[PDB]
Symmetry: D2
Subunit: 386 residues, 4 copies
């Protein structure tokens, strides 16, 4: 079977005007041959384009790429991971429905589920999804969806996607998984029985820290059609230039991910054995709870994770004396990023959810890039002594 590297470098589709690189269709609208041809396209008859919000060829080329790696029925690209998340949940959930979500989620995902969904009459329970029994107990007659992040941002908490997918299939709910932290090279939720797999493309998939985007991929034709129907009216679109840059970034995704993985594990083991570090939450470490689940259900690991210092002062000292690592939010870029979740990425999480997430001022989140690991380790080593 042809390798993913080869697949991403040779996507399906004809060349445009014999061009080797796929052109950037920086256009709003498309021309019709005749009234009938235009009318037919609006009814979904024949092949062609109408208007970029409905479909843009450069964006569609990127969608096909992601669809190929996910093994999906189709994919939809968005202006951001939040666009993909909004569009993969609110396209399905309506007043009177109930959502079960992980209690440790990306910051704006918490804002979405906690502030906006309940204004739309949607009941939401944030619960510890690392325990399938806790999902079963939280179930109600109107439960229509389970939403998971595994490993969770930022603590890397691992959930049993496969076992939860079984409960979802049995009980008639959709399973939506945000695989942003791991990339589709290593985590393919649709293979584990999820209905929807989504990513902040802003992170690993693009990988170059120069685009914000989102993608969502559905197991069924009907579901991706619904997501794109929601997208048409909600309006979170990937720009043609950004789609050009995301497809270009994804051409190196497999090699980048192999390096990220190996680099991140090397850094996590260095940190785990260092006298100043209390613990390291990398799902690929033997000591991490749910390592057994993450090794069985994934084929590799992302390189973003958190570790615990002895005090806030210690963390501040480390974060502020690094020469190679950059103090910034976001993750999955080619270069190494570091941040303080308590006062940056997860500062807006309500205090009750803060507690349940286990985030404290002593935690530091690092996103290991594709630099020579020895440079990242020497940078950290450098800083840790002072």
């Amino acid at each position: 079977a042809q390798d993913i590297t080869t697949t991403l470098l040779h996507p399906k589709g004809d060349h445009v005007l014999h061009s080797h690189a796929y052109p950037i269709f920086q256009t709003s609208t498309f021309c019709f041959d005749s009234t009938q041809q235009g009318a037919d396209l609006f009814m979904g008859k024949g092949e062609g384009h109408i208007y970029s919000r409905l479909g843009n060829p450069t964006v569609e080329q990127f969608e096909e790429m992601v669809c190929s790696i996910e093994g999906a029925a189709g994919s939809a690209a968005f202006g951001s991971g939040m666009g993909a998340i909004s569009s993969s949940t609110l396209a399905f959930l309506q007043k009177g429905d109930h959502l079960i979500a992980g209690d440790t989620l990306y910051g704006c995902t918490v804002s979405l589920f906690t502030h906006w969904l309940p204004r739309f009459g949607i009941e939401v329970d944030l619960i510890d999804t690392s325990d399938v029994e806790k999902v079963k107990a939280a179930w109600k007659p109107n439960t229509k969806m389970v939403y998971l992040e595994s490993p969770a941002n930022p603590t890397c908490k691992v959930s049993d996607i496969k076992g939860i997918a079984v409960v979802c299939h049995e009980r008639g709910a959709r399973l939506v998984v945000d695989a942003t932290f791991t990339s589709p090279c290593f985590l393919k939720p649709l293979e584990l029985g999820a209905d929807i797999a989504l990513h902040s493309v802003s992170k690993y998939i693009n990988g170059h820290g120069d685009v914000i985007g989102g993608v969502s991929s559905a197991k069924t034709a009907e579901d991706i059609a619904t997501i794109k129907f929601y997208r048409k009216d909600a309006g979170s679109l990937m720009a043609p230039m950004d789609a050009f840059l995301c497809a270009r970034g994804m051409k190196t995704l497999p090699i980048r991910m192999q390096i990220h993985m190996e680099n991140g594990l090397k850094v996590a083991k260095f940190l785990e054995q260092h006298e100043k570090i209390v613990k390291v939450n990398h799902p690929g470490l033997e000591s991490f709870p749910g390592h057994d689940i993450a090794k069985k259900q994934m084929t590799g690991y992302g390189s973003t994770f958190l570790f615990e210092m002895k005090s806030f002062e210690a963390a501040k000292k480390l974060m502020e004396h690094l020469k190679v690592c950059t103090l910034a939010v976001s993750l999955g870029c080619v270069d190494t990023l570091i941040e303080h979740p308590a006062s940056m990425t997860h500062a807006a999480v309500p205090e009750n959810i803060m507690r349940k997430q286990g985030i404290t001022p002593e935690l530091v989140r690092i996103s290991v890039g594709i630099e020579n690991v020895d440079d990242i380790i020497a940078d950290l080593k450098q800083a840790l002594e002072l």
Copy 2:
């Protein structure tokens, strides 16, 4: 008072590295100087950026330009007009609230209001907003918003923005106006009593047919903050390259709108006097109902409007034999576009709403560009006079 032409060419703000054009910040994140500086920006203390979804300098430059012409407290840019429309309605409306909206709206706006809003427990009525008495009769104790498009896409139906705004103001409802069809050069809903003014920037503001985007501007700091809070979580963003292009397109907005307006009126008059043409729905014509309101409440007219042929077959023969006009949907581009609403832009509108909207197979919509008007008229004339 400085002319808008000058204002748009001289936006406030320092240059970046002395660059004359404002740079394209094609970046996802921003660097912090220290833990405290980062922590503070997250609390909204100090000046600086964090992450492009929360704020991107190139996008913010474009927002300030729109804010300047609307006379707003702030503006928010989006990945599309639909992003602006969603974010300007659903950032405020919640389960149990009631919305009154016009019965003749842009198709995807109907789709949003009739399919998605009710799934969120929001009650919606589509009402003929050209009659303020019908707006009042549809009012309920839980009415929280009125949403208007005037002149309406595609029929150019005019609503009394100023009169409806009085009722909104007396009763605690927000008034939202989509002014896409006219541009902020000629219609400034915030001067007429609206709380929010929005546009599909995809149309006139950008003007060059090469970007999809949206913008919404609010009369108060609180309302623009809420819109941007919704945007953070809903995720309809204008990309940095698109913002660079929209700001660039907007540098010629005032002169383009002048030419559009004058061309559009001349093409409407030509059509109104032509034997093949039954009726012309351009709000600048004296024959048009509500011309008196449009003339009082706007300082000019867009150049997109609809006209009635004697038959579907006559409309098709006209649309398919033009050499200057391009058969395509969308509007507000420098070049002239033409389409058939009944089978194209409005073919997705439920027929209960299509009959009330007044859309029939005899209607053709044209979006007059900035070509020499005599060449546009000669194109139309040669097709209308075909064997």
Copy 3:
């Protein structure tokens, strides 16, 4: 005949995948159907592309637009005006050949002609081309080219393009004309007898101050092929993104030029009557030498020109106290620029050429944009009236 506004908005060519805007072909190479199809394209047989340096579809689109306004056999786009100038001169001149060029030329053109051409065994005289008799007197048996800028940058000195072309045609010399300062809306050198017309597209053609580029257009198929042969090996290319932006800027070129022309004449007239201003060098003024030639050979004027203050100190005081005008080099942008030739654009021109050129510390060059003209005049007036 169809208006140039309309022509530029409707360039010849098929749409690509029905796209309304012409796509950006951000590609280095193109795929071949077969060995034969590739071999044929290399032999110039059949239709298609090979590699962006030889030809890029987005760049070709922009070349077609310029070719249509110049009335040329073909046009070639470059990475800069200087790429165009180098490629329109060195594609033809060889060791032992002689060039006559104007004595008042854009600074880097002076650099090219005085530093690089002589190194290649090409003989160069810089001559006052406002006098045909001086051109004739400088002619030699080996004269192969005359190169003119009219009106000259920055003094606006006018040369008789038509009269000099007669001499070139009689004696077998190519006439090359840099029409940057005027734009092809108002100066069409190929109609006046030139063999090659070129521009810095960085200035008016693009108009938006965000691209550096050049274009050259030839009267004959042979000459444009020779220019592109030189380009292939010298390598000054317009990038696909830049070509997209240039074609986009050019969609508004005719209306921009109308406003530039009118604004520039009104600013020159205001300056001419102002007590602080010694002289105004705008070729549209009746007081200007060679106004008569410029009015017969052009159909309008650019809006970049020079004026004389009473002292260097007065020039600095004016330049540093403007709120609309921006202190910067370059010209032909939608917004108004101002600079000091003696210490900036023309500070590298060898001293003997500086006195021949007439550039002194009292001179200020203004490039009038498309802002409201009363706002520009009021900005100048308040600075001139300072304490």
Copy 4:
């Protein structure tokens, strides 16, 4: 290693932006007349006009400069811009140039058509032999220009040995290292004066930009190159510089894969019955392997092999399902072409025999796809 350096270039962030912004501008504003006057005289820090200097372009120049160990680098609108700028910035009427006899097609066009019109004497000679360089030497020889391994035959020149001759005799050595990338070949480190690349190939690597770069050992030489550029006008667009800097972030990792893939493919081809001979500089069989191994730290993945006939070549080139028939090289995906009727079709008949280019030769540029997939594509097209 090299990856860390490319990911952490020197300079301040602009407005705290993590990615370096795209300065899509033609001009820059001045704070005062004095500040503008000073900048024109080279006094103070700042920018004037994008042709003289653009911040996004400069960031890409600094990246390449860092890897070449140069005094400075200049970016261009194409490889040809870098080439014409690194030769004609120095050579003048009456000077003599010695160039390798096998070069990129357009380089042959530049040297044989344009340079002699400018009164510059040019001899193309076999630079794989240092003695032949010494024998072609004249009192007015001012430059040797090399491409090693050469395009398309991979013919290898002794850069180090020729540099010694050049230093001794007062000539500049200019080296086009396009085929190898600055990860593996650093001509300034072998004694060359100027090292240049078509950035369109490996450095960008993503098949979506045309661009050039030239790096000089001395501050004076890069100043001269940029002075020529100011007037000749081959510039890198700010968007292209943004794309080139971005591509270069994966350059070291892409090169490792290209190198390994290229060698595996060469070896497969070398033992295949259908293949007469493989010209890859990393093979034991190739003439000048010993020099390329001493003078380079790796190899590019573009190389040539010989089929038994034209018909056999046409058959192979037209039945590939993964490899794309196209000119150019050094892209992330595999390209294949026929030099005799494509890249090198315009080379003067005299020079092409001297190059040994025949209808039986095919050139492949091996991408970063899984090698087994590339090999299986070649296998089916050779055997079916």
